[PDB]
Symmetry: D2
Subunit: 381 residues, 4 copies
Amino acid sequence: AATFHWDDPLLLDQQLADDERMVRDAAHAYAQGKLAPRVTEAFRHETTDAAIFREMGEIGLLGPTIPEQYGGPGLDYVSYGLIAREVERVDSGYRSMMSVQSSLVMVPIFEFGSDAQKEKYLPKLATGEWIGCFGLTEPSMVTRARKVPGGYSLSGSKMWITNSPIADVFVVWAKLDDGRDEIRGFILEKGCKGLSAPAIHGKVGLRASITGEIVLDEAFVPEENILPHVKGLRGPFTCLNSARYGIAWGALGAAESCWHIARQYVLDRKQFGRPLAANQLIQKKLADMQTEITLGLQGVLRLGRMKDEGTAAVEITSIMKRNSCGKALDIARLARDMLGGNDEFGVARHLVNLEVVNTYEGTHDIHALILGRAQTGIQAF
Amino acid sequence: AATFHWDDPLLLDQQLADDERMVRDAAHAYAQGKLAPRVTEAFRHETTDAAIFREMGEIGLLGPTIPEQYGGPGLDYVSYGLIAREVERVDSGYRSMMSVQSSLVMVPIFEFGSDAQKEKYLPKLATGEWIGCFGLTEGSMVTRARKVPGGYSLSGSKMWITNSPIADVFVVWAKLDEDGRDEIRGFILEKGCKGLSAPAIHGKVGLRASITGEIVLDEAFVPEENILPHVKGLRGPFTCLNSARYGIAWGALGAAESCWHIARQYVLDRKQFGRPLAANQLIQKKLADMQTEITLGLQGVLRLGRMKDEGTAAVEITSIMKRNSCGKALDIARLARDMLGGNGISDEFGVARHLVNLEVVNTYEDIHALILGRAQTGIQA
Amino acid sequence: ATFHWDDPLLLDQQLADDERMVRDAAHAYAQGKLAPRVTEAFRHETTDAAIFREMGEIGLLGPTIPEQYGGPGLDYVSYGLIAREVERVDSGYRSMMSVQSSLVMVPIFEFGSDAQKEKYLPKLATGEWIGCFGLTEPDPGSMVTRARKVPGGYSLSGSKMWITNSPIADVFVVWAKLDEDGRDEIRGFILEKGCKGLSAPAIHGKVGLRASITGEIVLDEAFVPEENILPHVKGLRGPFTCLNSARYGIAWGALGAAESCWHIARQYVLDRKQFGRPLAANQLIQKKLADMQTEITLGLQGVLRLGRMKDEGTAAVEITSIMKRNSCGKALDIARLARDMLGGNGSDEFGVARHLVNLEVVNTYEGTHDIHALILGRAQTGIQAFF
Amino acid sequence: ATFHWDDPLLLDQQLADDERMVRDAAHAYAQGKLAPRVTEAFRHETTDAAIFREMGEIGLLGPTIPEQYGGPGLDYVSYGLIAREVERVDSGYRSMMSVQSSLVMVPIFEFGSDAQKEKYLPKLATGEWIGCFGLTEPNHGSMVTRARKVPGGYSLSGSKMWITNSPIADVFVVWAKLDDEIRGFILEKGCKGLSAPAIHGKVGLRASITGEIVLDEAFVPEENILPHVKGLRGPFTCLNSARYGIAWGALGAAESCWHIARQYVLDRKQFGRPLAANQLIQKKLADMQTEITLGLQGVLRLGRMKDEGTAAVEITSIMKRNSCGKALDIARLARDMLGSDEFGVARHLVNLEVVNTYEGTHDIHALILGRAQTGIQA
């Protein structure tokens, strides 16, 4: 008769290749060892210790799928997932910091940049010497690029850019007018005249990470700084799609923490002679947590394997990001409502983080509509 | 480059061996061909239909995991599930009939029986020549076996026994006191044997397409050669139930898919405000939830099926999958029912049949939440 | 003061003495005459047309219709109360009644000529004449039933589907488009049983509402004299006023079916044991019982207050959306809750299963759960989201 | 007739003229004085005991207490409308007020001596004296805080936890065992052996100052024990009265979330139109509207029943449980709609998460109600 691992019912551990398991082990060791002791004060006062980029770099956690050639650790998509799951187990803020370097900065430069851009930027982003941000979202994009001698002059604002006040490297999307008017990507650097990055304070969720603007006022960008190999929606969206995948895995790490913190709490606490764990209702909730996490992980894992094999279409990412974020939130709320205080209150932190996460990279509802269109051939917006 | 399959987002078809695809397609052809034309009649009138057993036996779908040595098709657990899903895709009542034969009759005989019992019973059960049934419901059981000359005499009633009013072979579990210990033992019986009655139950709300009844034991004589020698206690009926719940977890997903596909076609065909129903955001969200929940549920039963084939699967996992599958199928059936208008005459009101079937299935035994609550906490409620 | 678990807010004390007496008479009739019928009627899909006369005699047909025309001249609160008592037994019987009242008597009274009113209403009040309402076709703006002017009146061709009472109806109120002067508008026409070109075949093998006979209305150039056209309404206003009336009684009725499933569930857990303990003492069971009580209790406050506002003419049509959506949704959740609490498979308790399939149709008829959400959303925002 | 999206059942029209005045009085104060404070007060867990002064001035404290003792002599419906308007701004503010009214003034008025009543009620009423209520103990009816008879007459030892208002209280209503039964004792700021230190770093209710009560053989003069209550009836009476106020207040918080969510979807655009054009959005809006609309009928009728004398205690269980659960769901719906003023919702949300869980995580009101239906305890 087989052992039952309640904490891994389907033995995900045995579904992994050994280098994958050991990437997971390293990320785990790092987050629990270096981020967990930081998290309570950092979230409380809204502090980001940028040395974190430098830290994840040293052990090869920045841009996991980027080839060794360009300074990356040359890992697969399953490994990218496991890393994100381990970092978010501690805090979603720290997962975002990492999501931005990997998917929103390193990925566009690798996929759409020339050989010189890749050689100049990727090695230093891989180590965390250089910190990246990604400028898409604005306060139908308005930000413009006008051809000038030597390159391009950019004007417009981006808003809600994580990493931007501390960023070395900016991947900015703007419309460039041929007679056709299309979306292009540009690489900018800290120090470029016309480039501002004011910080943003007061966030309710993701408070462990720092966010800001990118303000452009005729910021000169040379010819060698336009991403040569992409035009239109493809650029920004390939980035978002990569990020959603890590977010799919990450939210599940958050969900596991809440689940474990709830589980221990009811083992520990008592009402009317018995530990809370004796309660029938309590056991249904714990069974719900375990079930949804268990299925979610098979979901993201399978997506990882398909992405690795090139058989994964983009709508699968809607399923998993929507599912992980939605279920993680449900689990955080269940866990929250199981607590009677006003320490094990890390749960309250995970909860407000997940409230934000479920709102970014596409709402729960817009992902539903993506699946609805793919099922019906009818757009509902 | 990779195409999306709304009907199989994760490409489960590609996660199978061509072997298991052919087993799946064979069961599909049978069920759509032979069972589907019957079902509305059989459900509405709670008809007694037995020719299904030969039909599935001929094509080697009865007792899939029983070796060829005893007339079985020697298949694995993954293939069992695929067959069960395909039968339930038509009706849970038919899947039920088939579940008794394979899991609750051929399985205990094969596992706990003597060689002679195995060659007497299994090959006739395998072809459907003999219809089996399973007497458990009435650890604290009241049905009793007494030591007598040349064997045992049995007394008691078994309630809600599917296939019983038409069975040729009865696997009855009764308590036997001997030497001081009062353990649980299993017994084989045959049709038309003195002291044995199998009267029917009519007027069921669900599972109507399947004949159910009682087993009535009035000091019924059983030879020594008919007591299952290799099991006493819990492990006897538990083994069978575990096997059945594996099949059920797979089967409920089939019924869930029927409701989903029916609801999807219906909202594409039906128009309101000059516009297909499928154009509505509210409709699309529902279709996204159905697709999500089935897709994850199918990865769940796939993994478990692979884990059983490698002896890596603890019994608690089965509780996860059976609970999830049945739960989610019912929600989906309710979602689909609530999406339809009109009342009973169209094909789409196959949803209503599936619905009441699943209401029975979901409450037949929250036994599984508790099993899992205890597996996590150690504490029983 | 003590607790009434069955009536926490003592709704019984919020009623007027006449309203209370009207309720007890509806209770006495439903329990005495309808309860003994319902199990076989539902199982065999039989409707005893004699029910309509029984209902007529005691003033349950067109409760709000004036005594001039045979109605008992009662207030809206009393109408609701009547619908709750009938639906306590079966939604199929409440259906029969709400059709006669809101979908037949109401439109003739409100829109008809003096001549039509006196010709039709008294016999619909006694139940001598059975009515049915022809709007739904195989939303009303996309209607294809067509009336065309001929010498002496109109010719009607089209098809109506899922029409309760139609196979046994003496009176048919049929909605059809008529191009006239400038505009193609919706008109209501009265038809009698026997009329040439008019057929009402029954529909058989329903999943829900099996206790009420339902059918079609098939018009094949059926002649309608000028005297049979509702003179005093055009367009959506016609069908809608009737539906608003029907939804009000449906919103009260559904709480009746909810109450039955609640009472049945509670008695069951009082009787059954599990692991040596009465099912009643389980915590989760008590949570479900508390949810049922709460939703019913609040749902009743809602429909009563709606009842009051209508009687004093302060109620807008949107408040009917709230209470129809709420009563039906909550009643369905409660029916599902009760069903999931029982083991077995088909007895007295599987009266719940009857109430359940009934409520599944009810939730789906006279505007879906979602359609009423969208009426409410539009009223809150000024932006229509229907299409 | 005209439809009122924001008051579909015309609750205005169900209230007496003086009841509508008291509501608006509380509304005016809340929006005028409390709303401009709340963001900073909440964010930095600062409380301004001036609120007691301002509420006492306009008679919002102990609203059901007779004019004879300095209260406004109002009815239960009025208390409810007051709770609702304060919580509309913040659950923390409502909490401080609800302690003053239901957990201090009510037991003194109900169980006290005429002299205790004359000393404390008037100063509590004006908010010159700030009160608090000592029942809940660190780990725990069967409490451990005990009174033993000394010479005239009592010595109390024990601890009480999560006590709102304590670090700023003038008056302390403590429940202790004495033989063996539960009794209430009045202590005042200054009594030797009595300490009320603050609890900092709360997730929710951050706008109400909270603390503990530590009694180290604190002496209570014999004149200070409540003479007219023994056992469970004492603390329960206070809790039942407070639950009633919370039942109204939770709806006020729910209303703000609904109104904030509504305006947000009206103001914000996506794909060329307002969010409010989305079907998924309108259904949420319709649910919020329905549950609030119904919840209000429920607490209004309960109010009228209290004023009549026709309400058992179990009804308060239905309404508190409903109001808190529904308010919390609505707050979460509202949170999940937002992409700033609007984030008043996140504050209402953390408040409602605390408020819903305050009486244990095992749903005591379901059981009270289940018991009441079956006759069989859980």
